[PDB]
Amino acid sequence: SGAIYVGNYRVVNRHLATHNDWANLVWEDSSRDLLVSSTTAQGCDTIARCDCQTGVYYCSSRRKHYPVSFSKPSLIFVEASEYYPARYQSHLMLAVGHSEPGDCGGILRCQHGVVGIVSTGGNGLVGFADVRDLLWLDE
Numbered sequence: 325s326g327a328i329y330v331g332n333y334r335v336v337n338r339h340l341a342t343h344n345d346w347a348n349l350v351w352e353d354s355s356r357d358l359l360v361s362s363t364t365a366q367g368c369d370t371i372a373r374c375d376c377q378t379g380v381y382y383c384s385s386r387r388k389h390y391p392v393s394f395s396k397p398s399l400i401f402v403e404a405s406e407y408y409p410a411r412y413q414s415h416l417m418l419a420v421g422h423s424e425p426g427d428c429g430g431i432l433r434c435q436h437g438v439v440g441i442v443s444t445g446g447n448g449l450v451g452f453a454d455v456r457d458l459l460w461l462d463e
C-alpha cells in the first residue's frame with residue numbers, strides 16, 4: 325500500500341483505490357494502474373520533472389529503501405493477477421529488485437523528487453508507474 329500527496333491530490337495504484345477515492349475522482353487510467361483523487365488538506369510531496377534513471381524505492385516487504393537503476397517509461401506486458409487480466413501496462417519502468425504484491429504504492433524517488441510508485445513485480449524485478457509526465461499534478 326501507499327500514496328503520493330501533492331497539492332490537493334492523492335495518487336494511488338488504481339487497483340488499491342478505496343470506494344472514497346472513486347467518489348473524489350480527478351483522473352484514472354487502467355492501462356497505467358493509476359488513480360488520482362482530490363483531497364481537502366494540502367500535500368507536501370514534490371513530483372520530479374526529469375529523465376533520471378537511478379533512484380531509491382521503498383520496499384515494505386523488507387522495511388528497506390533500495391537504490392536502483394530503472395528503464396525509461398514504456399509499454400510492458402504484465403502477467404495476470406487478482407486485479408487485472410494479462411495485459412500491456414503503459415508508462416511502466418522496470419528495475420532489478422525485490423517486490424511482493426503488497427509493496428504496490430511504495431515511492432520511487434530521485435534527487436528531484438517523486439518519480440513514481442511500485443505497481444508491478446515478481447521474479448526479481450520491480451516495476452514502477454511513472455508520474456513525471458502528469459504536469460497538472462503541480463497546479
Ligand SMILES: CSc1ccc(Br)cc1CC(=O)N1CC[C@H](C(N)=O)C1
Pocket residue numbers: 339357402405406407408413423424425426427428442443444445446447451
Ligand atoms: C509489486 S506487484 C507484484 C509483486 C510480486 C508478484 Br509475484 C506479483 C506482483 C503483481 C501484482 O500483484 N500486481 C497487482 C496489480 C499490478 C498491476 N499493475 O498490474 C501487478
Ligand SMILES: [Zn+2]
Pocket residue numbers: 372373374375376434435436437
Ligand atoms: Zn530526477
